Symmetry: D2
Subunit: 292 residues, 4 copies
């Protein structure tokens, strides 16, 4: 499922930094119960950066086993070398995931033609649906609407998570792609605006701690009831901002711990424990949302 | 050494995308003859992003073998995960390299405290000298002078490659570190300016194809002969700019092939072959520098 | 009238640089006939910068005389000194204009508190409605939503022309102001998006040459018929971009001359005549819009 | 001269907002005693934006009278309209000023060809030496090195105040102009660096309150004594930063009052009185420099 509120799920860890199965089960049950549309497993918010390939596959497989067919799972699968991206994607074929979230090559700053070849080749070598992920603040490269237009013609490239926060991209892309191509916000603070402009949903950090309100907001937006969705969005707006007061997923993991959703807020270096000042800003945002 | 003209050497490839030993030997001999001070092996310009860790080590080991003690070799060794950077660096202990060029975590955008802990931990698990590498346009992370100052206190963190192109950083860092911390430019176009402000050399892309000019420029600079140095700079300025006309190392590999320094200009996806327009551009720059 | 398609009208000049009454009459008749909502006289596109105070008042008065009650007129009235802004605004009280478009102080980069005091004082000293004008690319200062919220409480401050092109500002502002506060786009390329997000109209450059299509687009947008408005917007999008291929109003004046709407395309230094390359880009945009 | 430490002098005011002759005399005597090289009268820091053209001329004439030939006086003379800049400059012909600091048109964002024609026309209608002034953060216009090169050929365009803080510009301009074109910094924080790269002095805000230190810094710099110069720079660096804690000249006028150099810190709207927090900040900077 590729519409509505999709959670960019944390990968909960014990005090040693290893994946905590009990905490993950608690999160998945929460998402099933709260009407979340799907789970992105080992995306950015899932510390894709710091898990080894074994861990990355283990977390996705554990998420699928725990979900037990109750909610669809999308795996985070990008890489900055095209042969690697292909390789890692093969490993998930027939896993039970419904799709892959594949980021633009980071660090090596490819041309638009390079991006076209990269993603075309990934898609050629799988039957899985691919969702392109554009996040220039992290990767140093910006997948432009024209190139998204070229890629949307590839049968298996089915949508984009547009994380620039630049709302002009919504209708620049829409006009170049077919009506079944999915446009998903990757910027919680601008996501309601994104849907009002014609976007189809959000791949959300805030959804980790406010799943029901996120799922209701996105349904109201889909129905056209923007004034009603905006009431919910105004209560969540402090979280949408303050979950990035320190690098993601530091604040959201601390919030999940405070709510009792995970056992510990531990992350892997170079992510650091939340500062005291951060804890206070996040807890005030949680109170604004009505969660504490 | 860690001073003068240090080449960010290309990883020359065959048509299959694997390292070409004959071409690498030819380059290394060229650098020895040209007066280059050191070689950074499998840094950014050497396609660190698209070699796997074994391929990367094979290139470094081959480069050391071929250098045969005639020219010092520094290995590119970043990772965006701290545990992984430590293992990946450990592999070169007792290899023969003289130090490591370690990049700031890319994509995950750690805090300055996070950067401090990452580099401190790397430095504690090795005896090799570490040169920090700041290139926010690629990494989405900017290692600020205050943090460099804190890290320069760690015994084996010995210098920085400052690739922002922001010349104010030279004296901001110089005032916070001891007189033997090395400051190197990572931006060819501003490197002579960077040395004029107090920097000690440059880790250069342009040096791949103008090694003698780059070494003579840097010697003059170190001797305080800036007007003289600048005449050489003006001759090379179109190269300093146009070797980034398309994403590095696309232009510089073509240039190396056009000069007879390597057998093929092949790169790995998502890097693409140079366009016709890019060729003409780089060819005019080579003509300007007197190399063609 | 402060809703719909409002034209940022050129000030047509003869070959000597003096205002051309016959050309101005032709434009005003065209706007009356084409369903434009109102005319902004001597705004940015009207070369407010280069007219002396005598000329500025003369053009507004001539525009009012020629309009003859058929279309409302808004005068451009900003200044970067608060006493001056007050002074110039007094001169239009009882003129027959319906309102003033008052820009944020340019060059001196005031604080948000400074902006608050500036605009509060202007509004205090007139009965005329004031429309705030935010255009940081021109002024060096950015009137933020919080400050717009404070100013919207002043009885006479009735709306804003938001020219950043940053579409997140629409609902940031809306939520802080009352439902009768008018939100007007000042960025033709993003103006339809702006209205879809809840904006009320556009103060438009494109409207100078495509008045009817602009007026129909804005009415469809007001009715909620965004798919229909977007068809028109897609035909106008080359003009929305290419009217800024050289500094405004250079391209739009050349376009008005090409259509026969004004006698000459003359501007005042430091605005320069359109280049040949500019003429060709603009004429292709006009053909795309169906106007040539 | 047009070299060494040149003060961008405040226009001290009474509580009514008009020039305070007693305070201006005291400042001018202070500069003569301190070794300042020249005074820029009614530039940016002198509130050029909020004086009318007569008030501006009165200040310049009073400054010359009070200077009594002891220290050269340059007048701020920009306009964003070419015809107006020419008239406004003509007024100072035979006044006694030694030259004019003429700003790039603000707000109307002319092309480089437009900037060339504007400055060329100004220079042709006067015999006074013109110093170009590039400050895109205030003007929205960036006068590029290539254009400076073209303008430096005009006999009485004699130098540039480069207030971008972009240190690469020093050598880009120096390579295109003759050895007697003057390059001055307009950014206190980077001015010593700018001189280290080949610049000839600074038009300084900090010099209002640390005139002796600034003059000694600039002498040392001109003599090649950069380490010595830098010790003075480090003492003044918090001032160089915090005199812009709130919009210039809000901090520097408060500082002048706190030092007993002027009678009141009054400014004209939209400049606002300094906040309590800003006072404490600037006071700590003054303490650091040893001036309080
Ligand atoms: K498709
Ligand atoms: K050290
Ligand atoms: K109001
Ligand atoms: K000259």
């Amino acid at each position: 499922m590729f519409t509505g509120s999709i959670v960019a799920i944390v990968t909960p860890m014990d005090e040693k930094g290893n994946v905590c199965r009990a905490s993950l089960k608690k999160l998945i049950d929460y998402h099933v119960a709260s009407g979340t549309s799907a789970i992105v497993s080992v995306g950015t918010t899932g510390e894709w950066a710091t898990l080894n390939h074994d861990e990355h596959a283990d977390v996705v497989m554990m998420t699928l086993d725990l979900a037990d067919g109750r909610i669809p799972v999308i795996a985070g699968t990008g890489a900055n070398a095209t042969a690697e991206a292909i390789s890692l994607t093969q490993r998930f074929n027939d896993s039970g995931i419904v799709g892959c979230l594949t980021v633009t090559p980071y660090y090596n700053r490819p041309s638009q033609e390079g991006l076209y070849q990269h993603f075309k080749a990934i898609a050629e070598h799988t039957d899985l649906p691919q969702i392109l992920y554009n996040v220039p603040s992290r990767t140093g490269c910006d997948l432009l609407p024209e190139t998204v237009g070229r890629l949307a013609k590839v049968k298996n490239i089915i949508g984009i998570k547009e994380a620039t926060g630049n709302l002009t991209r919504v209708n620049q892309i829409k006009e170049l792609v077919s009506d079944d191509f999915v446009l998903l916000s990757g910027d919680d603070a601008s996501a309601l605006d994104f849907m009002q402009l014609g976007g189809h949903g959000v791949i959300s950090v805030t959804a980790n701690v406010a799943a029901r309100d996120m799922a209701q907001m996105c349904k109201l937006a889909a129905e056209g009831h923007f004034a009603e969705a905006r009431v919910i969005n105004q209560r969540l707006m402090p979280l949408h901002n303050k979950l990035f007061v320190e690098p993601n997923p530091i604040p959201v993991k601390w919030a999940c711990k405070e709510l009792g959703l995970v056992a510990t807020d531990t992350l892997r270096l170079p992510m650091t424990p939340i500062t005291d000042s951060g804890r206070e800003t996040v807890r005030a945002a949680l109170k604004h949302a009505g969660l504490l």
